[PDB]
Amino acid sequence: SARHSRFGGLLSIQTPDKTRLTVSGSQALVDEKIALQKLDDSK
Amino acid sequence: LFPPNLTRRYFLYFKPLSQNCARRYRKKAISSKPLSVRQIKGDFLGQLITVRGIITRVSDVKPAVEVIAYTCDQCGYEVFQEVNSRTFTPLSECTSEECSQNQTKGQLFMSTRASKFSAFQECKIQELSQQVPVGHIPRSLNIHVNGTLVRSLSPGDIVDVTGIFLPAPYTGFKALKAGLLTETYLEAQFVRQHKDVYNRLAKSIAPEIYGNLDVKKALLLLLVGGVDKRVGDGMKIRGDINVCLMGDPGVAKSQLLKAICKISPRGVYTTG
Amino acid sequence: VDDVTGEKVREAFEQFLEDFSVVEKVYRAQIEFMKIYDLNTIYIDYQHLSMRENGALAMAISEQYYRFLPFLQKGLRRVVRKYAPELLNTSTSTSPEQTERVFQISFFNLPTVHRIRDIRSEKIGSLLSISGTVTRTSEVRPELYKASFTCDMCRAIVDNVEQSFKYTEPTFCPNPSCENRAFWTLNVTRSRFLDWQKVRIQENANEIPTGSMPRTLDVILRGDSVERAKPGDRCKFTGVEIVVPDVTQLGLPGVKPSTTEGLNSGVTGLRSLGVRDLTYKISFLACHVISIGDQEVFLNSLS
Amino acid sequence: LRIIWGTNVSIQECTTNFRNFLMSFKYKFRKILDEREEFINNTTDEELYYIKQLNEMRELGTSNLNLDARNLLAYKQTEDLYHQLLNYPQEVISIMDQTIKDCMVSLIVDNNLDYDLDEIETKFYKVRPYNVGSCKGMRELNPNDIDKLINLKGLVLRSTPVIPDMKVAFFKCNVCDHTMAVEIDRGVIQEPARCERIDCNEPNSMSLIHNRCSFADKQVIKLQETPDFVPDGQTPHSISLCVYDELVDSCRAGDRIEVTGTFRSIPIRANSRQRVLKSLYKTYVDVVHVKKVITDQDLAKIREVAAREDLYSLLARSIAPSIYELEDVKKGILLQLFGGTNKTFTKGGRYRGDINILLCGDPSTSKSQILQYVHKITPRGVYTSGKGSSAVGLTAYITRDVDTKQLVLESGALVLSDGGVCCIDEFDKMSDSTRSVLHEVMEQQTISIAKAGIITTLNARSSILASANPIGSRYNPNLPVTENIDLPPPLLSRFDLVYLVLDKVDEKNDRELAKHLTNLYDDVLPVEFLTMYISYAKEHIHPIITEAAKTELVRAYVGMRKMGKRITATTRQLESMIRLAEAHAKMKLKNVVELEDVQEAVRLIRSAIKDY
DNA sequence: ATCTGCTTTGGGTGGGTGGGTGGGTTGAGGCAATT
DNA sequence: AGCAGAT
Ligand SMILES: Nc1ncnc2c1ncn2[C@@H]1O[C@H](COP(=O)(O)OP(=O)(O)OP(=O)(O)O)[C@@H](O)[C@H]1O
Ligand SMILES: Nc1ncnc2c1ncn2[C@@H]1O[C@H](COP(=O)(O)OP(=O)(O)OP(=O)(O)O)[C@@H](O)[C@H]1O
Ligand SMILES: [Mg+2]
Ligand SMILES: [Mg+2]
Ligand SMILES: [Zn+2]
Ligand SMILES: [Zn+2]
Ligand SMILES: [Zn+2]
């Protein structure tokens, strides 16, 4: 992320069914593969 | 689902019982009866009372948290926690039904965008000079202001603050050490603030002395201080008329200073 | 897993210290000179490094000095072994205490010199020079370098325990039968200590913007570079910009942990940091110092 | 599908909207929006603006793009983007940054230029919005503004040293020496429980190598509101800021700045042991933009003014226009500003090129005026009054930093005037120690301090232009200058020129002065041109003496000695004359000292010896 | 997963072999330098 | 009471 760690951008990804998951990170704000990678890694 | 306070967009305050209305209906109004900081004793705790004094200190407005909104990085749910104390312990593990059923350990994180904050401000109220007994020193009392009452008190104003007299319990170890002694404060709920031309003006400047027409004229000229200061060439001629009074002790110098300083809007009285 | 980049950087360093010339060999002679007079620091001209290897080797060291420094010490030791085998051991009767020298590499003559106000966090771990006027100097203390412990129960020994910014002890005894994991006693006889001095410097007066308070920094000297800076001097240090953790939080034996209005929040989540955070500071590690500002004995000095 | 948390606005639509805005936009839209369409030209307004801004940025290698909010309101597409920026600044700024990077790479990809692409891929790109609405007040910041873009105008008050903020953590194994870098999220390290290597899967064998991590620049500034925002006059409040990356050290203490940032709030822990937090939240501002509120042509103009026949009187008049009928004093001060040549000598000591002038006379006349003017003109200098607590202090002094509780050596006014003019308004009332340090400066041109364990010397190559007043209510011509001035003969003997400006009561003189003063209710030069000319001459020109000048100097000195047994002149006057001639040569931008320069110098020195 | 155990706030119911660059800040009294 | 460690 270009900005600092505490910038604080929050995400809401929509699953094929109508449920929303939350991800943090500008890269997630831009991309979806990064979002899924973070979802897997945060487990 | 979410606490009732989260969706509230209003603040509730109590206006005390006015003296005239209490007398109209043959009743006694404790709430609107003014008290000094001395009379506010330990048996008034938990009541709606009024205090008379002058404000000596007002802190800056800041956000006080009422409801905290968390988020789950796995379940995708949101949690709400209510805070009604000086301190609190944040949540660190998801409590959502999905997380518990699936056992997934999803960390909870704070979110300031969804929380609820109330404007907070702390003031101090001190006894008036005429209220302190003989051979005593004045006392002061804390005041808490929340909601839309903030910025309604400034240092120097003589006010009749109406509020709820409550204790401020300590927390954790400090509570154990402090014993049974308790700090107290007042939750502000209502605040009442208290309140030939040349010759005529000169003679009216200070009527309690014997007339000094020339000095009074010069002092009035000082007070108005008319000047056109726009040289704009690097600096400008001074835009104030300065006056000096020098006399043997016995003439009304201090009285003239006091009067000329009270009349002026920006007058500041000091001693060398 | 070996560091492939680390090994190759060492190989290039050895080639530099054997074939360089300007027409006699320069650093080969210095190692011989160091052998005669029994010194420790070996000085290297940065300009000498750039010309060799199209300048590639110089960039690797300068950009990442903290990472590659241990490999340089390996490289020097090999070149020391080929030409001056006796130098490695530290200098009527047979002395028993001949440990291994603790060499130091000093660099000078960098292309540019940085002001105190121009120190940023992008250069952490790199090699650079700075200029400032000293204002306070600490006292020389012994710094633990290679600690040596003994197991409290089976009397085993642990040697060469690299020390981080805080006191460090072993976590696993080398005796298979032993079960000790967190019980040790230091052995100051076998431990190696290095000299250590803390110097505080501030930016030069002429470089201060008008009506601005000065900036300051803390420089750490070691070995023979100690006491080379006196307060009031205008020096030029050359070292590596480092970051020093708040050792109180990390957990010290017998120590209880614990400008910016509370906004200086550190990083957390580390295993050692239970619920506390680790905050950092910018510091310096100088390896070179320059201060900008009887008949028979006298005759011998003259040319 | 990607949606910002708590809202119903798509990120993809935002990205495409801003990309369309950037690739196609013209200033004419902004002009018509502000009702300035009639000022539209045909070349600049009709050319793509931000495409040119990206091309120039690529050419210069910079990354930061200064964006104005109104331009978003100028384009039909981006009204919602502007409002979202004002309401959700973080995510909007993120998508803006990525769109900037994407369009930057796309430009090269489409235009198949020879510029390297790997270098572009390595750069972090940013946008710095500003002018996002009427600036609010520090006292009007309510909780409703938390996480929202605001504008603050305030005076800087302090700035802490650069703080290393961690970006990427670095971990190393203790049994396989395997390292992997793990990013950071909101200040928490996601440290691993075991090596990622299949072969070595040992658990809980990770260490943090602090010096191999990645850090970013952070700094904390303190801000205080402007005077005009104070309603009654109470103590101004203070707000704390945070600046990251290229905005670090973007403003110095005492500056008036306008800051655009996100009004954030963070919890505070009750103690450094547990996780309990105080209910009160502390606020601050996360800044994204800060604003503060010689050429060949200049050289040609300087030559044109230099060639002017009446250059001398022109500069003299321009120095201090508002003063009346003090030509000699102004001429002397003009010479002082330029300063004589400075000599670096081998086999010999250093010879100072400064000029010290004492402006002493009755209190009625204008003397602090001239010092203020000189301070304004001087490229370097200070203003001070002897025995004045307000002034910084004339001598370097050791003190303790209250902010950091450290000892710091602080240079005084004289040292800070190095290469400039230090105007001391009240020369008469001075401490004896101050008069000793002044003697050391005017003699050795350095200040030596050897206290608090520090032994140091500071260069103080500064001129002096002091003013003096008589002991009584007026200057008595009968008594000598020394008796009236109340200064040691050793001290007033060192000034190169001493000016006795007396207010003798004359009908004509008072008439003229009153006429001038009342009217205040021959071209002249702007102060900026004068200071640039002075700096150019003082940095580039170095006049040299010649045989004719050497003859005239010797002859004039001998003549000034022969006038007297009373000693009319001393060898000090010779140094004064040579310095003044050098300064006069400098003013003409001449590299040589002619007969005219030495003759002008003698006329001023002889007149100065005259009434003094 | 449960049981066992230490330490705060800040303050003298921890201290001066931990000090004052870890904070608790006015009041009085002695000494050198300044007068 | 919260958090740090041994069975
Ligand atoms: N003309 C006057 N008429 C009435 N009272 C006067 C007059 N002049 C002086 N006084 C009285 O004189 C008393 C002393 O005056 P004040 O304190 O103002 O000045 P002062 O004694 O000259 O001052 P200082 O305190 O500097 O010695 C006041 O009570 C004032 O009422
Ligand atoms: N050309 C001039 N000649 C004489 N007096 C002047 C002139 N221009 C301005 N003045 C007067 O001088 C004043 C500014 O000078 P200033 O008061 O500083 O006098 P000074 O001699 O430097 O010092 P002091 O403060 O002791 O009077 C202006 O307010 C005006 O009264
Ligand atoms: Mg009086
Ligand atoms: Mg004056
Ligand atoms: Zn969950
Ligand atoms: Zn063992
Ligand atoms: Zn491993």
CATH classification at residue C69: 3.30.1640.10
Residues with CB under 6 A from ligand 2: D 323-324, 363, 365-369, 469, 513
Smallest CA–C1' distance to E13, residue: B177
Helices (H) and strands (E) in chain B, counts: 7, 9
In a domain, C251, yes or no: no
Do C106 and C58 lie in a common domain? yes
Torsions phi, psi of D172, nearest 5? -135, 140
**Residue B99 touches chain A, beta carbons under 8 Å:** no
Resolution in A: 3.2
Do C153 and C40 lie in a common domain? no
Do C202 and C133 lie in a common domain? yes
In a domain, C301, yes or no: no
H or E element that contains D378: none
Residues near ion ligand 4 (Cβ under 5 Å): D 368
What are the strands, taking DSSP E only, across D196-308?
206-208, 214-225, 238-244, 256-266, 277-278, 282-292
Q: Return d(Cα D343, Cα D353) in angstroms, integer.
A: 7
Q: Return d(Cα C198, Cα C141) in angstroms, integer.
A: 10
**CA at C225, C1' at E16: how many angstroms apart?**
37
Q: Exposure string (b/e) for B50-67, b if CB count within 10 Å is 16 or more? A: bbbbbbeebeebbbbbbb
Do C149 and C127 lie in a common domain? no
Which nucleotide's C1' atom has the smallest distance to the CA of C200?
E21
How far is CA C17 from each of CA C5, C12, C26, C69, rounded to the nearest angstrom? 19, 9, 9, 15
Do C117 and C242 lie in a common domain? yes
Q: Assign residue D245 a region: left if phi > 0, alpha if psi is -120 to 50, beta otherwise?
A: left
How far is CA D86 from each of CA D5, D130, D148, D247, rounded to the nearest angstrom? 16, 11, 6, 21
Q: Return d(Cα D145, Cα B117) in angstroms, integer.
A: 11
Provide the domain count of chain C. Answer: 3
Q: What is the CATH number of the domain that holds C211?
A: 2.40.50.140
Q: Do strands D149-159 and D256-266 pair parallel, antiparallel, or not at all (unpaired)?
A: antiparallel
Question: Is residue B253 annotated as involved in ligand binding?
Answer: yes
Which nucleotide's C1' atom has the smallest distance to the CA of B89?
F2
Residue C161: domain span: 142-194
Question: Is residue B28 annotated as involved in ligand binding?
Answer: no
The residues that bridge with D451 in the sheet, in sequence order, are none
The two three-digit tokens of residue B162, written as one number: 């109406």
Residues followed by a break in chain B (C to N exceeding 2.5 Å) are 195
How far is CA B105 from each of CA B79, B102, C281, D191, rounded to the nearest angstrom? 15, 9, 35, 17
Do C59 and C36 lie in a common domain? yes
Amino acid at B206: A
Of D5, D95, D216, the CB nearest to A4: D216
Torsions phi, psi of D218, nearest 5? -135, 150
The two three-digit tokens of residue C80, written as one number: 């020391």
In a domain, C259, yes or no: no
Query: Which of the other chains make 3 or more beta carbon contacts under 8 angstroms with chain A?
Result: B, D
In a domain, C94, yes or no: no
Q: Return d(Cα D264, Cα D261) in angstroms, integer.
A: 9
Query: Angle CA(D298)–CA(D299)–CA(D305) in degrees, nearest 5?
Result: 90
In a domain, C60, yes or no: yes
Which nucleotide's C1' atom has the smallest distance to the CA of D404?
E21
Minimal Cα distance from D189: which residue of A? A5
The answer to whether residues B121 and B47 touch, using CB atoms and an 8 Å cutoff, is no
Torsions phi, psi of D52, nearest 5? -65, -40
Do C2 and C108 lie in a common domain? yes
The answer to whether residues B129 and B168 touch, using CB atoms and an 8 Å cutoff, is no
**Residue D279 touches chain B, beta carbons under 8 Å:** yes
Do C1 and C61 lie in a common domain? yes
HEC sequence for C158-192: EEEEECCCCCCCCCCCCCCCCCCCCCEEECCCCCE
Would you say the C-alpha torsion D51, D53, D54, D55 has a positive or negative sign?
Answer: positive
CB contact under 8 A, A10 and D5: yes
Do C125 and C147 lie in a common domain? no
CB contact under 8 A, B88 and D6: no
Using alpha carbons, select from D533, D542, D573, D543 the residue that is nearest to residue D556.
D573
The two three-digit tokens of residue D163, written as one number: 């703080």
Using alpha carbons, select from D321, D327, D351, D349 the residue that is nearest to residue D339.
D351
In a domain, C272, yes or no: no
CB atoms within 10 A of CB D137: 15
* DSSP string for C245-285: E-HHHH-BTTB-----SS----BB--SS-SS--B-EEEEEE
How far is CA A24 from each of CA A33, B173, B237, D81, D528, rounded to the nearest angstrom? 14, 36, 62, 21, 53
**CA at B145, C1' at E14: how many angstroms apart?**
39
Query: Which of the other chains make 3 or more beta carbon contacts under 8 angstroms with chain B?
Result: A, D
Do C104 and C128 lie in a common domain? no
* DSSP string for B106-169: -BEEEEEEEEEEEEEEEEEEE--GGGS-TT----EEEEEEEGGGTTS--TT-EEEEEEEEEEE-
In a domain, C265, yes or no: no
How far is CA D397 from each of CA D66, D423, D448, rounded to the nearest angstrom? 43, 20, 10
Do C204 and C176 lie in a common domain? no
Cβ-proximal residues to B35 (8 Å cutoff; 6+ apart), any chain? B49, B50, B51, B52
Do C146 and C237 lie in a common domain? no
The protein residue whose alpha carbon is closest to atom 27 in ligand 1 is B249
Instruction: Name the CA dihedral angle for B127, B131, B134, B139, rounded to a multiple of 10 degrees.
Output: -20
Q: Which chain D residues contact residue A40 at CB under 8 A? A: none
Question: Is residue B254 annotated as involved in ligand binding?
Answer: yes
Using alpha carbons, select from C47, C62, C203 the residue that is nearest to residue C123.
C62
Of C165, C257, C269, the CB nearest to D189: C269
What are the strands, taking DSSP E only, across C33-126?
41-45, 104-108
* DSSP string for D504-531: ---HHHHHHHHHHHHHT------HHHHH
Q: How many CA atoms lie within 13 A of B182 on its CB side?
A: 12
Using alpha carbons, select from B137, B136, B132, B190 the residue that is nearest to residue B161.
B190
Torsions phi, psi of B58, nearest 5? -130, 125
